[PDB]
Design a binder for this molecule. Structure first.
Ligand SMILES: Nc1ncnc2c1ncn2[C@@H]1O[C@H](COP(=O)(O)OP(=O)(O)O)[C@@H](O)[C@H]1O
Ligand SMILES: Nc1ncnc2c1ncn2[C@@H]1O[C@H](COP(=O)(O)OP(=O)(O)O)[C@@H](O)[C@H]1O
Ligand SMILES: [Mg+2]
Ligand SMILES: [Mg+2]
Lengths: 371, 118, 74, 160, 371
């Protein structure tokens, strides 16, 4: 039979059968209970709208993501999300399909063990396998080397790989991602008068960020230009009218990636954690990693980031090496495409964690040889 | 330098190549046919005591077994060449699959067409 | 690669292929028929083995072209 | 080559529906008499999905190469093959390997230039600007004159 | 048929058919297992890369030479190296070719006996013969007398020969060679800030030594000059950029040959062990040995050594004798060229150790008449 390549993510759940080009169903991972009282009788009001249904009734819900930073903080809601994904968005019972979840690097063990225990006890799948979210993104590019920066919505991690041999001592995981950029944008919008507070209006700020923000090639020059002319002010129409005008908030929101001091984080930007991740590698594979830097994940879709990052790394790196940044147009679904490719391989067909194996060793089987 | 001329030239030469491939195949066919014909060693089957018959067929059996043994050894040798070919294929597919490894997949099914149902 | 084992497999096949024939368990003409059967079977074996040598030659072709490519990569 | 087999396999289910529907939609007649003998472009327009242009160009040129200028039931099948993916899709790479093996039956470690010389001589195609240029360019894909296996390997591939 | 003139060496395996001018395949003798984990599936990752393949993937391997000082310390790896040499670099099955190995003087017996036992049992050659590495280097020079200093990469030995009669009591074998010079260079580079530690970076230090170091004609004057001017500082580009500048480390690394007290060795330099080896010879053949001093081996390729050694010996030797140092341009492959010449001789054709002889007397046949 065919395998189910699910990809929990944090912000958008992407799923679909193995062997295709794009995920079959992509929908936000939010579960929102209603918060008001409700007076109409017999309206058929449910107790929790999940997935894309709660992005249409969000006016009277309190949306809450079940995955904070890679890790899962609310297991009941995550179980509900998985149940919805299997039964309503794909309509395939899990009793007859292997599953291939994905997990960020350096995550707590208990999260992974609980994930496999749920998949084997509640949904009762035949066999499931958990894979690191960066190796798949490297599969999708058709490479076999390279250092991949997978800046998702929950957590940004940077896994270097050479000739198929991952370097476990050079993984640099940073917890700044799309959600913190949304919060920072929502916080700097208040400097013009627009106040978004409700958890429903966070979605509106996210839409503003997606449609308007861009990464500046040079930050100081853009700050000077936006403060003199008015060629940058782009307007946007809220879900009820009252258009708003975003000035130099456009390139200040995604600039937080390269200067995490804006949101008070100490660490260095995504332009310098990649160079540090390279320098921890051996001295003889640094040229190949320099030449095959891969971008993935949703948050790396800002217009103009593949040039800013290349300029920064070229500034840091030695002058002789060639710096090349691979930015495929299908960046958002790169991890899932790689997952489909991996699940479609014949050599991989014996790596699944078969159910009888789980029955013999318990949920701690995932840390064992079947990784 | 014209694209049309290049297409004509490659088409004609590729068809010439295909025809010569078929010619090579049939020439090999004739080679093998003649080879099996000249392999045959006819025997004077008549006017022999039936014990001589059994003995002669046993000699044929011995030669047959030895021949199949030689074929076995050469099969093993070509098998090892096959393993080496697999290794070199792995080498080139490594060098090029670093960029084109997942090219094996199933695409273009339902998302591209079924769109307004939702 | 451990020629005692490979030769052992060969001997197992040959003794297996030692389809030894009995005395009063075959007819004289039937014995002739079996002889021709072996004749033709081995003829087909020879054709297959000749094609095998051809494909082995093609394998050597691929070996030389591949290693030459490898050197060109350096 | 694969052209006639692709025409034969056009007798199928998806392309049969495609041809019938195309005729019913935008092959009807009742025009002003302009003679849409070139309705090939009209069908390309009305397809709603244009395939790779090589199908279109080979159909435009090779069909009615005698100047028939007319599309028959069989030519309807040809156009519909051009619509769907009835292509040979680069033939068999096994055939490419076997051809290159026949080329190096002399075993030059690669298809020598004189292989191409004799093959063009057999094909008899006039030595144009494309001729000799293609051969040297493939052999000197390194631009150093050394013909290697992958050079002609990629040179011959992608074609049917 | 033709004979296989293999030459194990220590650092570079040189092989080729008898009767040519240069070895057919020359490649480092290192076998390196991968050390990291490896995450890509189906990449076709082998368990040990040997020869020149492990000098390209050395970034993720742990290279380890199977021959320490002439002697062989790891027989499985040496067998692997031989198998590679026969099957992939020459592509000739050993069942149909005599072999002519080479061995340093004064080596343990068990090494030689195990070598012949391997060649006769595993590879199953028709006949093999073991020859001393210095007599061949004397063959290649076309001489018949002379004292040859064969400073390889493992061990430096100094065999005097007169009129074809070797003098077994005058062989002076010293264990300082190219490898110790590499280690000493790697140790003195730390005085400028460059630290090379990994077994892969030893190869980089070896390349630095080969391309930059030279032997000073007079040591104190060079030390004084390099400490005042800056005309010696030559720069070199690492495999990733960050050029380095070598100062007076250039002529201090190969100076260890003439003053083995630098690396703590007690013995005298290669300039004085040659004179001692001569003085042990008889009083009537010292003039000929003085006039026909031969250099060989890789490590004697330093620019300016054929003058320093001549100056030193002229200082030591009596003033009347003429001191001449033969330094052919084909120094590195001198031993192998001599091996080819010896294997091509008709008079030598009956000295091989035929297999039936080994079957009758066991591996201890090598010490017998067939030397
Ligand atoms: N076109 C876009 N431009 C800018 N940001 C985007 C775009 N699309 C998505 N994002 C950001 O990326 C996030 C989605 O990232 P995604 O890759 O789905 O995370 P995950 O790894 O959890 O799947 C969204 O929250 C959004 O903030
Ligand atoms: N051009 C060169 N200049 C200086 N040193 C060299 C040069 N070439 C080789 N060497 C040194 O000699 C060694 C090779 O010696 P070689 O003669 O191959 O040893 P063996 O006797 O084991 O074959 C290398 O390790 C290197 O350190
Ligand atoms: Mg992700
Ligand atoms: Mg030597």
């Amino acid at each position: 039979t065919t395998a189910l390549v699910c990809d929990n993510g944090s912000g958008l759940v992407k799923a679909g059968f193995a062997g295709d080009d794009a995920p079959r169903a992509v929908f936000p991972s939010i579960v929102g209970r209603p918060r008001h009282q409700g007076v109409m009788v017999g309206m058929g009001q449910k107790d929790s709208y999940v997935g894309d249904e709660a992005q249409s009734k969000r006016g009277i819900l309190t949306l809450k993501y079940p995955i904070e930073h890679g890790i899962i903080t609310n297991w009941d809601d995550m179980e509900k999300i998985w149940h919805h994904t299997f039964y309503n968005e794909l309509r395939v019972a899990p009793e007859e399909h292997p599953t291939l979840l994905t997990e960020a690097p350096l995550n707590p063990k208990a999260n992974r063990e609980k994930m496999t225990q749920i998949m084997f006890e509640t949904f009762n799948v035949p066999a499931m396998y958990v894979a690191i979210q960066a190796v798949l993104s490297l599969y999708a590019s058709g490479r076999t080397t390279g250092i991949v920066l997978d800046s998702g919505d929950g957590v940004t991690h940077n896994v270097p790989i050479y000739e198929g041999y991952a370097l476990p001592h050079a993984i640099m995981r940073l917890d700044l991602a799309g959600r913190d950029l949304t919060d920072y944008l929502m916080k700097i919008l208040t400097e013009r008068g627009y106040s978004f507070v409700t958890t429903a209006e966070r979605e509106i700020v996210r839409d503003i960020k997606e449609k308007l923000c861009y990464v500046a090639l040079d930050f100081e020059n853009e700050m000077a230009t936006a403060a003199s002319s008015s060629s940058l002010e782009k307007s946007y129409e809220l879900p009820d009218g009252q258009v708003i005008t975003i000035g130099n908030e456009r390139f200040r929101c995604p600039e937080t990636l390269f200067q995490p001091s804006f949101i008070g984080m100490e660490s260095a930007g995504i332009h310098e954690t990649t160079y540090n991740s390279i320098m921890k590698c051996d001295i003889d594979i640094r040229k190949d990693l320099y030449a095959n830097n891969v971008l993935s994940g949703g948050t790396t879709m800002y217009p103009g980031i593949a040039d800013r990052m290349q300029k920064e790394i070229t500034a840091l790196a030695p002058s002789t090496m060639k710096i090349k940044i691979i930015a495929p147009p299908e960046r958002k679904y790169s991890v899932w495409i790689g997952g489909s490719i991996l699940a479609s391989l014949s050599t991989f067909q014996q790596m699944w964690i078969s159910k009888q194996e789980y029955d013999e060793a318990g949920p701690s089987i995932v840390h064992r040889k079947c990784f | 330098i014209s694209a049309s001329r290049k297409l004509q030239l490659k088409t004609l030469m590729l068809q010439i190549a295909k025809q010569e491939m078929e010619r090579e195949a049939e020439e090999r066919r004739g080679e093998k046919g003649r080879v099996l014909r000249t392999r045959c060693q006819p025997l004077e089957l008549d006017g022999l005591g039936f014990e001589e018959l059994q003995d002669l067929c046993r000699q044929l059996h011995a030669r047959v077994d030895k021949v199949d043994e030689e074929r076995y050894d050469v099969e093993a040798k070509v098998t090892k060449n096959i393993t080496e070919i697999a290794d070199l294929t792995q080498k080139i597919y490594d060098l090029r699959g670093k960029f084109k490894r997942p090219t094996l997949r199933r695409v273009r099914i339902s998302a591209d067409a079924m769109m307004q149902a939702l | 690669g451990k020629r005692q084992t490979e030769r052992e497999k060969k001997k197992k096949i040959l003794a297996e292929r030692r389809k030894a024939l009995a005395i009063d368990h075959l007819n004289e003409d039937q014995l002739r028929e079996k002889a021709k059967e072996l004749w033709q079977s081995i003829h087909n074996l020879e054709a297959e083995k000749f094609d095998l040598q051809e494909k082995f030659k093609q394998q050597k072709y691929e070996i030389n072209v591949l290693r030459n490519r490898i050197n060109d990569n350096q | 080559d694969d052209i006639y087999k692709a025409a034969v396999e056009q007798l199928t289910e998806e392309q049969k529906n495609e041809f019938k529907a195309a005729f019913d939609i935008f092959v009807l007649g009742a025009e002003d008499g302009c003679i849409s003998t070139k309705e090939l472009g009209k069908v390309m327009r009305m397809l709603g999905q244009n395939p790779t242009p090589e199908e279109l160009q080979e159909m435009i040129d090779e069909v009615d190469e005698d100047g028939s200028g007319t599309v028959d039931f069989d030519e309807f099948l040809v156009m519909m093959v051009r619509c769907m993916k009835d292509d040979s899709k680069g033939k068999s790479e096994e055939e490419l390997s076997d051809l290159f093996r026949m080329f190096d039956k002399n075993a030059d470690g690669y298809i020598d230039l004189d292989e191409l010389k004799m093959m063009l001589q057999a094909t008899g195609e006039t030595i144009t600007e494309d001729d000799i240029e293609e051969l040297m360019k493939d052999g000197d894909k390194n631009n150093d004159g050394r013909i290697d296996y992958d050079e002609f390997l990629e040179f011959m591939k992608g074609v049917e």
